[PDB]
Amino acid sequence: TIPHLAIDPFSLDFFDDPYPDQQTLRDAGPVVYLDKWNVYGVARYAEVHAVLNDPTTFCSSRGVGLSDFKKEKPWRPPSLILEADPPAHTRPRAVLSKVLSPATMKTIRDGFAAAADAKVDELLQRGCIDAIADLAEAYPLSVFPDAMGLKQEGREHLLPYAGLVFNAFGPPNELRQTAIERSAPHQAYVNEQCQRPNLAPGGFGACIHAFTDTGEITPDEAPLLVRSLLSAGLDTTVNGIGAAVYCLARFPGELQRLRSDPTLARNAFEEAVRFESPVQTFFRTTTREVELGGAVIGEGEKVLMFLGSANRDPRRWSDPDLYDITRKTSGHVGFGSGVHMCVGQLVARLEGEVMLSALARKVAAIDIDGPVKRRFNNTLRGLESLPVKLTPA
Ligand code: HEM
Ligand SMILES: O=C(O)c1ccc(-c2cccnc2)cc1
Ligand SMILES: [Cl-]
Question: What is the total count of domains within the chain?
Fold first, then answer.
């Protein structure tokens, strides 16, 4: 009934060009079995959406990586939000929602936009830059650690820690095992910055600790929720902004449309999230026997959701492989769907919008002018190096 495939979706060959293998996974059937790792897979939009939206059957508290927390010890104490199910999930989620709220966005927007305009002006003075290190990484580094309230010393640990977190959702391949081998100094730094005295007043970290007296979370929960933001909030935006710039570099017609109407910036970023799907994959674990797209999956089974494949499924999308900045993107699953849908999506969209607005207003052309190098990670899709010449408007 269920087709068995030997595709390794965590192999470097797959990361280097996932699209043929993703079509193979979709067209093999609504549910496949991946013999390489002994997990079920779903790569069509319909089944990915269905799994995301049934958290009771497809739970998160046994881990959203390959490892089953019921069988192995997690590599660090479990997340109180990403790796929790309702009802334990509900109040931590409510707190991060209020911390990363519309009102917080209103407080930080003008500074985030100024930093974006400043970065693009700086990059235009150089002309030839690396859109990864010099833009996708430098811009989030210039705003997010400060918005968290982190001290200056030690910020060089943040991207390495994120790379570790995202590799650790994967199977025990060399990417994962190498990351864990090198983890100890990054864990030590991060865990220390999560304590209330180390988080500057008014930042996201202090706000989490401020919410510990409402009955939603206790003081001893606040450090691990700060940990959630220090795990998630930087490398995601690096690869979302990188995705958008790479799209604009490859599709000059869409850069030209964005220049002519800079208010398309927010949707241009959203389409880049659909088109590249920088967060590629998450797992769930079945809590019972279940029928999904005609197949029967037993209890205690890992299910791998291919978010990026779902976002290119022609059963759901017209011209899925076209970057279209005026596409109706609502319903894409690049930020998830349902009770765990990205609680940081307003930060992500703010950063992406203000960066693409700065490009739309200041840049006439983005031309790749050097070798493109991909960055390999078990969960994140994105580039290591993207050499571009920026032409000023
Ligand atoms: C382009 C950028 C981003 C993308 C594509 C993205 C993608 C996602 C996805 C797919 C999920 C669902 C996980 C699941 O269902 O198991 C998620 C959840 C989450 N994201 Fe993001 N994310 C981004 C940015 C951010 C940022 C900037 C932050 C923090 C400031 C953040 C914090 C979180 C948290 C805390 C969760 C867990 C929510 C929950 O379990 O209820 N994310 N994200
Ligand atoms: O440590 C955590 O709780 C945590 C770690 C990573 C994420 C995450 C992953 C992908 C996109 N957005 C957020 C979320 C939460
Ligand atoms: Cl840690």
Answer: 1
